């Protein structure tokens, strides 16, 4: 029944949350202060931190939804839900940044080598964290039922957040990955041996992004603008949570173990 399909879909989410926390802790330990001559490692460290925050927040959320939410809980529950959302948004922004950096490394290699600011990843990540925190401090301040809660303002701030996420982070990331794919297939695979690994990893990252991370972003959009039945909305929420869980738990595998050159 519905309860069984919720319990099963939440147990998997908790298990993959624990696995993702372990993987991101390993990535932070193995890359926190080293491997930093690489221009690609600052984004990966920040993404690992963001994914660890996401998985910890939503693991706590899933743990404390078993308990009744009346007076003691349901106040930390909202805090950790906003933490989950903020970490999800910053992780999506960091994935877009990683894909754009990879595309620029091959579209403009001279700039990436001898003209890129050496701290550009650092303050790009700082700007992403600051902007995500600011946007989530508006979504929470206008839609949480423990703050200056409103009805006409929640819808506007959500139509800002979801529209920005989808119609900016999806086109930019997918277009950058497609351009990198096309450039490698045309100007690099034609002369020497075809880099099948590059095609495989780019396609896998794009597929994981679109099929796993984006469902949680579009669930907020389809909650409004459409009269979803209240019985099946919990199923959609569970699907979105598990998809984002899988994406965050697999990010260390497809961004660190694949990109492990100093660990050799
Ligand atoms: C409100 C949106 C503002 C714009 C956000 C754009 C996020 C993706 C692009 C910026 C991050 C990556 C920039 C290139 C990184 C690099 O190659 O050094
Ligand atoms: C406001 C949105 C865009 C933010 C862009 C932040 C900086 C991104 C990294 C540098 C992009 C340009 C790279 C060199 C391009 C070139 O000259 O060929
Ligand atoms: C919550 C706001 C702050 C979030 C973190 C800010 C960005 C931190 C970036 C990683 C650590 C600094 C890295 C600087 C560059 C380097 O050491 O090579
Ligand atoms: C990093 C992604 C998000 C980047 C942009 C963050 C801020 C988005 C907009 C916030 C809500 C603004 C709503 C309108 C406010 C007004 O008209 O006064
Ligand atoms: C403190 C940093 C994170 C939050 C930054 C964004 C601004 C938060 C507050 C937004 C609402 C401001 C107006 C409140 C009006 C009211 O009291 O109803
Ligand atoms: C991470 C910080 C985000 C911004 C928060 C700014 C403060 C928003 C207002 C909080 C008011 C709390 C007390 C009144 C609550 C209520 O009237 O419902
Ligand atoms: C990451 C952004 C977090 C923004 C702040 C979220 C706060 C959610 C509510 C927490 C409990 C607030 C309790 C005091 C106000 C009240 O009495 O309702």
Residue numbers in the entry: 22 to 285
What text comes from the article?
MrgD, a member of the Mas-related G protein-coupled receptor (MRGPR) family, has high basal activity for Gi activation. Mas-related-G protein-coupled receptor D (MrgD) is expressed in sensory dorsal root ganglia (DRG) neurons, the cardiovascular system, and the retina.
The overall structures in the apo and β-alanine-bound states are similar, but the ligand-binding pocket shows a marked difference. In terms of the ligand-binding site, the conformation was more flexible, and the RMSD was much higher for the apo state than the β-alanine-bound state.
